Write an enzyme that holds these catalytic residues in place. Structure first.
Site, PDB file in Angstrom:
ATOM      1  CE  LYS A   9     -13.694  -4.571 -10.973  1.00 25.77           C
ATOM      2  NZ  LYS A   9     -14.611  -4.835 -12.112  1.00 25.77           N
ATOM      3  CG  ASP A  10     -13.187  -6.603  -4.436  1.00 26.48           C
ATOM      4  OD1 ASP A  10     -12.999  -6.822  -5.651  1.00 26.48           O
ATOM      5  OD2 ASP A  10     -12.358  -6.010  -3.717  1.00 26.48           O
ATOM      6  CG  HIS A  25      -2.114  -0.931   1.053  1.00 26.09           C
ATOM      7  ND1 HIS A  25      -2.903  -1.300   2.118  1.00 26.09           N
ATOM      8  CD2 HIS A  25      -2.623  -1.564  -0.030  1.00 26.09           C
ATOM      9  CE1 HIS A  25      -3.841  -2.133   1.703  1.00 26.09           C
ATOM     10  NE2 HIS A  25      -3.694  -2.309   0.402  1.00 26.09           N
ATOM     11  CB  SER A  33      -3.494  -1.451  -6.690  1.00 27.87           C
ATOM     12  OG  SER A  33      -3.773  -2.494  -7.606  1.00 27.87           O
ATOM     13  CD  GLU A  67      -2.854 -33.200  -3.178  1.00 27.80           C
ATOM     14  OE1 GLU A  67      -2.739 -34.439  -3.276  1.00 27.80           O
ATOM     15  OE2 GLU A  67      -2.169 -32.514  -2.392  1.00 27.80           O
TER      16      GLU A  67
HETATM   17  C1  HEM Z   1      -3.877 -16.113   0.128  1.00 30.75           C
HETATM   18  C2  HEM Z   1      -3.033 -15.532  -0.732  1.00 30.75           C
HETATM   19  C3  HEM Z   1      -2.957 -14.015  -1.034  1.00 30.75           C
HETATM   20  C4  HEM Z   1      -3.686 -13.004  -0.536  1.00 30.75           C
HETATM   21  C5  HEM Z   1      -4.826 -13.053   0.506  1.00 30.75           C
HETATM   22  C6  HEM Z   1      -3.225 -11.779  -1.150  1.00 30.75           C
HETATM   23  C7  HEM Z   1      -3.722 -10.521  -0.908  1.00 30.75           C
HETATM   24  C8  HEM Z   1      -3.608  -9.460  -1.775  1.00 30.75           C
HETATM   25  C9  HEM Z   1      -4.502  -8.329  -1.879  1.00 30.75           C
HETATM   26  C10 HEM Z   1      -5.766  -8.095  -1.031  1.00 30.75           C
HETATM   27  C11 HEM Z   1      -4.049  -7.519  -2.835  1.00 30.75           C
HETATM   28  C12 HEM Z   1      -4.746  -6.196  -3.232  1.00 30.75           C
HETATM   29  C13 HEM Z   1      -4.796  -5.949  -4.735  1.00 30.75           C
HETATM   30  C14 HEM Z   1      -5.601  -7.031  -5.394  1.00 30.75           C
HETATM   31  O1  HEM Z   1      -6.414  -7.683  -4.693  1.00 30.75           O
HETATM   32  O2  HEM Z   1      -5.436  -7.232  -6.624  1.00 30.75           O
HETATM   33  C15 HEM Z   1      -2.834  -8.114  -3.379  1.00 30.75           C
HETATM   34  C16 HEM Z   1      -2.028  -7.618  -4.379  1.00 30.75           C
HETATM   35  C17 HEM Z   1      -0.871  -8.179  -4.868  1.00 30.75           C
HETATM   36  N1  HEM Z   1      -0.453  -9.489  -4.658  1.00 30.75           N
HETATM   37 FE1  HEM Z   1      -1.389 -10.799  -3.368  1.00 30.75          FE
HETATM   38  N2  HEM Z   1      -2.208 -12.087  -2.024  1.00 30.75           N
HETATM   39  C18 HEM Z   1      -2.016 -13.453  -1.978  1.00 30.75           C
HETATM   40  C19 HEM Z   1      -1.087 -14.157  -2.709  1.00 30.75           C
HETATM   41  C20 HEM Z   1      -0.163 -13.605  -3.567  1.00 30.75           C
HETATM   42  C21 HEM Z   1       0.842 -14.324  -4.327  1.00 30.75           C
HETATM   43  C22 HEM Z   1       1.014 -15.857  -4.280  1.00 30.75           C
HETATM   44  C23 HEM Z   1       1.542 -13.424  -5.038  1.00 30.75           C
HETATM   45  C24 HEM Z   1       2.726 -13.613  -6.022  1.00 30.75           C
HETATM   46  C25 HEM Z   1       3.249 -14.787  -6.380  1.00 30.75           C
HETATM   47  C26 HEM Z   1       0.995 -12.119  -4.743  1.00 30.75           C
HETATM   48  C27 HEM Z   1       1.443 -10.935  -5.276  1.00 30.75           C
HETATM   49  C28 HEM Z   1       0.760  -9.743  -5.289  1.00 30.75           C
HETATM   50  C29 HEM Z   1       1.195  -8.547  -5.966  1.00 30.75           C
HETATM   51  C30 HEM Z   1       2.479  -8.359  -6.797  1.00 30.75           C
HETATM   52  C31 HEM Z   1       0.108  -7.506  -5.692  1.00 30.75           C
HETATM   53  C32 HEM Z   1       0.107  -6.046  -6.198  1.00 30.75           C
HETATM   54  C33 HEM Z   1      -1.132  -5.731  -7.028  1.00 30.75           C
HETATM   55  C34 HEM Z   1      -0.848  -4.539  -7.898  1.00 30.75           C
HETATM   56  O3  HEM Z   1       0.342  -4.152  -8.010  1.00 30.75           O
HETATM   57  O4  HEM Z   1      -1.809  -3.975  -8.476  1.00 30.75           O
HETATM   58  N3  HEM Z   1      -0.038 -12.262  -3.846  1.00 30.75           N
HETATM   59  N4  HEM Z   1      -2.603  -9.297  -2.704  1.00 30.75           N
END
Ligand code: HEM
Ligand SMILES: CCCCCCCCCCCCCCCCCC(=O)OC[C@H](COP(=O)([O-])OCC(O)COP(=O)([O-])OC[C@@H](COC(=O)CCCCCCCCCCCCCCCCC)OC(=O)CCCCCCCCCCCCCCCCC)OC(=O)CCCCCCCCCCCCCCCCC
Ligand SMILES: CCCCCCCCCCCCCCCCCC(=O)OC[C@H](COP(=O)([O-])OCC(O)COP(=O)([O-])OC[C@@H](COC(=O)CCCCCCCCCCCCCCCCC)OC(=O)CCCCCCCCCCCCCCCCC)OC(=O)CCCCCCCCCCCCCCCCC
Ligand SMILES: CCCCCCCCCCCCCCCCC[C@@H](O)O[C@H](CO[C@H](O)CCCCCCCCCCCCCCC)COP(=O)(O)OCC[N+](C)(C)C
Ligand SMILES: CCCCCCCCCCCCCCCCC[C@@H](O)O[C@H](CO[C@H](O)CCCCCCCCCCCCCCC)COP(=O)(O)OCC[N+](C)(C)C
Ligand SMILES: CCCCCCCC/C=C\CCCCCCCC(=O)OC[C@H](COP(=O)(O)OCCN)OC(=O)CCCCCCC/C=C\CCCCCCCC
Ligand code: HEM
Lengths: 51, 378, 49, 106, 62
Positions: free
Chosen positions: B226-227, B200, B204, B270
């Site tokens: 939207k979500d 943050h 994003s 799986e």
């Molecule tokens: C339970 C698993 C995860 C949760 C709850 C989570 C949570 C979130 C949330 C709430 C956002 C806000 C923006 C959006 O929703 O698009 C976000 C963004 C992001 N996430 Fe995750 N994430 C998870 C797993 C991952 C994984 C596995 C990766 C990469 C391998 C990742 C990489 C990113 C990145 C790079 C952003 C930035 C979005 C942007 O730049 O617009 N996240 N994540």
């Protein structure tokens, strides 16, 4: 505590009482519906899912 | 002077949710990230009510689940929501990572790395949890996966027996796996808090890849509904998977008791692990297959280093987009090959698919990125 | 006419022409922190009442 | 160093230029470039009217992306239409960084 | 000129949010039962003779 007494506070509480009737009815009817209370629900014209 | 700005809890909620700017042009793909945040809750809550009947002894782990699916009221819906819920969890996960790979979201390197670690955490969680039911595939999968640890050259077997708690997989291993499976997801949650924390302070990303400071908008009015729609469609697809075809993402044989003696035929793990498993099938060497396995997931960390284009999103760079969908098709190839017995046709296609899987993103992508650079005259 | 005015009258009329409306809005800059129109339209009505 | 084959290069560059979608959104080439700190300082040095044109075209692009529409065909950016405004500045900035680095390694 | 039914539905109810929540909960109060017996009547309609509750007559109450 003592300051809250006052005629405008009386006017204000009188202005906000009906809203309390409404939300009280909301919470009461909502509580009965959620738990499906047998005693209150049967009295109703149509809701007889309980046997 | 709004109260949100005053009380610290209302301050943090005012940050993370109600007021933080987002690009306006964010699409349906980013929603998957939030969906993951939702899935975890389900995987806790639902799972929390399976732990209240499950007995982690080897002699009773199966019968206890029979107790859940039969004797317990409304237990089967919890069982199937849980099991299919993990599958939806990894689907949203793969789509999420693909989104991050496609739009150049990996440039937020710290967030990327926390995402990788959280990925490994979810993988271990799903593994030990799949070991819990104590069926045929569960017991056998545990034996096969655990032995890989044995691969490590010097420490090997002492470490493997240290996981087993004995010579062989048995009740203590099951109890241990129940404990770690119980404990890991909350750590995944704290990591997720770190994840959003790093995320943050920059904001994003948007699909065009251009900075969106000119068109930032509050999160609450728009992306909450939207979500809400995305979460509703998620619950829709999940409930359709559970109430109509509970089994098809799963595998028969788990409903049989584990036999240390007897060995099941197809022995397929799986589906979300399958592609990785193919790599084990691909390299004849043991330790080599293990290193190729660890590289299969670590490799994501090297992507930002390998970036060469002077742009983020692939959408303006069609060639790299075509490589991207070649990569997706290749993942489908491995994912399908993991379901198949070794035979002439499969072994050759598996090796070629693996080598292509490594070469396309360690070689071809940077080079065609440079070509896309020269084509646009800078 | 003004003497006829009462607090209840002011509540009835202000509730009649102001409450839960769809306001025209104008802003000559540097606006950017000014709330998006949904925030304003949401700000035209209480949930407590 | 090719001649007519260089005109062929102009042709394939034109085709690839039309393959990229930013023309559909009215963007100049330089709007699309990733904004790392060098590009950041490069944008900081822009003349005010040009910087304004850039910010507005970026908003028009994001706004078109909002409603998933497309700029009308008459209004699309043309391959010969573009002015490569940001290049001299970005080259100055990058050259300054290379100078500071070459001094810094000694 | 004449008020639309949506408007009479509006000013009498929707303008005050508490009445709105109230009519929502009452609406749930009827909709639960209605949707219940309706969907059950449908599911009963698809497979008459298969469900045991109507099969009871061949053996029930002595
Ligand atoms: C339970 C698993 C995860 C949760 C709850 C989570 C949570 C979130 C949330 C709430 C956002 C806000 C923006 C959006 O929703 O698009 C976000 C963004 C992001 N996430 Fe995750 N994430 C998870 C797993 C991952 C994984 C596995 C990766 C990469 C391998 C990742 C990489 C990113 C990145 C790079 C952003 C930035 C979005 C942007 O730049 O617009 N996240 N994540
Ligand atoms: C695994 C399966 C997961 C499937 C995706 C689930 C979530 C998709 C999503 O992001 O929300 C809906 C999302 C809403 O549109 P959006 O918010 O603008 O998403 C950004 C666009 O991708 C921005 O790109 P675009 O504006 O150029 O439009 C992309 C899309 C255009 O699709 C749309 O405009 C939106 C959906 C309208 C078509 C609905 C068809 C009937 C249902 O083009 C395609 O349909 C993909 C081509 C190949 C499939 C052709 C037929 C599929 C329909 O629609 C899609 O992302 C496309 C869905 C593709 C269906 C699967 C096809 C199989 C491959
Ligand atoms: C039964 C009793 C109900 C009445 C309670 C009276 C309490 C006294 C009071 O001062 O009311 C505050 C506040 C009154 O709301 P308000 O009239 O809009 O005035 C608040 C200010 O205007 C604040 O103005 P604002 O523009 O900053 O508003 C921000 C926006 C807040 O935006 C949101 O609601 C955030 C939701 C999306 C974020 C999640 C993202 C997920 C990813 O709207 C709200 O304030 C809605 C508040 C809902 C929860 C209240 C917080 C307490 C916890 O409490 C209520 O919301 C009462 C509504 C009750 C709902 C039905 C409950 C049935 C059970
Ligand atoms: C058995 C059950 C008993 C309870 C019945 C149900 C209860 C339902 C829930 C009650 C919720 C109360 C709703 C009122 C919401 C208004 C909140 C707030 O806005 O009111 C403020 C103050 O409200 C009053 O203090 C309270 C009014 C309502 C009190 C009614 C209580 C009646 C209880 C009588 C006893 C009967 C039951 C006893 C059982 C033991 C005034 O607002 P404000 O915008 O700042 O005023 C203008 C600005 N000022 C202050 C600067 C002027
Ligand atoms: C798996 C993890 C996630 C959980 C699953 C979530 C599933 C939800 C997905 C479905 C989407 C729901 C969103 C739909 C919109 C919600 C309704 C909301 O918008 O109502 C607003 C306001 O809300 C209601 O007015 C107040 C509440 C009414 C109903 C209350 C029922 C009881 C709920 C209490 C739950 C409290 C939680 C604790 C459990 C008891 C109306 O605002 P608005 O349309 O703009 O303007 C209206 C103007 N009025 C009011 C003057 C007419
Ligand atoms: C493991 C996989 C096992 C799953 C089994 C079967 C899965 C099949 C997956 C195939 C789904 C692909 C369909 C997507 C349709 C589509 O992308 O339409 C084209 C559309 C056009 O986009 P624009 O460039 O914005 O167009 C500009 C116009 N304004 O392209 C996209 O938007 C797609 C970009 C989002 C990527 C999402 C792809 C989902 C799969 C990605 C996973 C691959 C990464 C794997 C890494 C995992 C490592 C742990
Ligand atoms: C991201 C988080 C989680 C994921 C992806 C996940 C996934 C899984 C999977 C795939 C299974 C195998 C079930 C089957 O195939 O039949 C499972 C079972 C189980 N899970 Fe989770 N899980 C998560 C978190 C949790 C949590 C927080 C709990 C808390 C109690 C939990 C408790 C259980 C239990 C007790 C079982 C075995 C009981 C049974 O299968 O009947 N899980 N989980």
């Amino acid at each position: 505590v003592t300051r809250f007494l006052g005629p405008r506070y009386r006017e204000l509480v009188k202005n906000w009482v009906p809203t309390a009737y409404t939300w009280g009815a909301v919470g009461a009817v909502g509580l009965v519906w959620a738990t499906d209370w047998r005693l209150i629900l049967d009295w109703v014209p149509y809701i007889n899912g309980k046997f | 002077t709004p109260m949100r700005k005053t009380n610290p809890l209302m301050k943090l909620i005012n940050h993370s949710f109600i007021d933080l700017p987002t690009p306006s042009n964010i699409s349906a793909w980013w929603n998957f990230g939030s969906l993951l945040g939702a899935c975890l809750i389900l995987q806790i809550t639902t799972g929390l009510f399976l732990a209240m009947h499950y007995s982690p002894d080897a002699s009773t782990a199966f019968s206890s689940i029979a107790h859940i699916t039969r004797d317990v009221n409304y237990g089967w819906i919890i069982r199937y929501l849980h099991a299919n819920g993990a599958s939806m969890f990894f689907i949203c996960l793969f789509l999420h990572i693909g989104r991050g790979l496609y739009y150049g979201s990996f440039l937020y390197s710290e967030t990327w790395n926390i995402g990788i670690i959280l990925l490994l955490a979810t993988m271990a969680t799903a593994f030990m949890g799949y070991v819990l039911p104590w069926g045929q595939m569960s017991f056998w999968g545990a034996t096969v996966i655990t032995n890989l640890l044995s691969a490590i050259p010097y420490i090997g077997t002492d470490l493997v027996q240290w996981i087993w708690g004995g010579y062989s997989v048995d009740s203590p291993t099951l109890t241990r796996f129940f404990t770690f499976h119980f404990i890991l997801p909350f750590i995944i949650a704290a990591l997720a808090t770190l994840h959003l924390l790093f995320l943050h302070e920059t904001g994003s990303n948007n699909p065009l890849g251009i900075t969106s400071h000119s068109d930032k908008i509050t999160f609450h009015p728009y992306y909450t509904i939207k979500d809400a729609l995305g979460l509703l469609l998620f619950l829709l697809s999940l409930m359709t998977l559970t109430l109509f075809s509970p089994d098809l993402l799963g595998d028969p044989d788990n409903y049989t008791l584990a036999n240390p003696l007897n060995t099941p035929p197809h022995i397929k793990p799986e589906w979300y692990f399958l592609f990785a498993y193919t790599i084990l099938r691909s390299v004849p060497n043991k330790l080599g297959g293990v290193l190729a396995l660890l590289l299969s997931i670590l490799i994501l960390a090297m992507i930002p280093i390998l970036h060469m284009s002077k742009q983020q999103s692939m959408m303006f760079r069609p060639l790299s987009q075509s490589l991207y969908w070649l990569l997706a098709a290749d993942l489908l190839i491995l994912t399908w090959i993991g379901g198949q017995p070794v035979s002439y046709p499969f072994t050759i296609i598996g090796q070629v698919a693996s080598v292509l899987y490594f070469t396309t993103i360690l070689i071809l992508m940077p080079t065609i990125s440079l070509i896309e650079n020269k084509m646009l005259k800078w | 006419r003004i003497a006829e005015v009462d607090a209840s009258v002011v509540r009835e009329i202000c509730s009649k022409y102001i409450y839960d409306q769809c306001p025209a809005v104008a802003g000559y800059g540097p606006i950017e922190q000014l709330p998006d129109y949904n925030r304003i339209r949401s700000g035209m009505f209480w949930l407590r009442f | 160093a090719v001649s007519a084959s260089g005109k062929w290069l102009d042709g394939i560059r034109k085709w690839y230029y039309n393959a990229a979608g930013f023309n559909k959104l009215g963007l100049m080439r330089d709007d699309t470039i990733y904004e790392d700190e060098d590009v950041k300082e490069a944008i900081r040095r822009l003349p005010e009217n040009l910087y304004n044109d850039r910010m507005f075209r970026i908003k028009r692009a994001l706004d078109l992306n909002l409603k998933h529409q497309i700029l009308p065909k008459e209004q699309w950016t043309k391959y010969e239409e573009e002015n490569f405004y940001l290049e001299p500045y970005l080259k100055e900035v990058i050259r300054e960084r290379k100078e500071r680095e070459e001094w810094a390694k000694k | 000129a004449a008020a639309t039914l949506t408007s009479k539905l509006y000013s009498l109810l929707f303008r005050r949010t508490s009445t709105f929540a109230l009519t929502i909960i009452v609406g749930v109060m009827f909709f639960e039962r209605a949707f219940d017996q309706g969907a059950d009547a449908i599911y009963d309609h698809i497979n008459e003779g298969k469900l045991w509750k109507h099969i009871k007559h061949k053996y029930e109450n002595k």
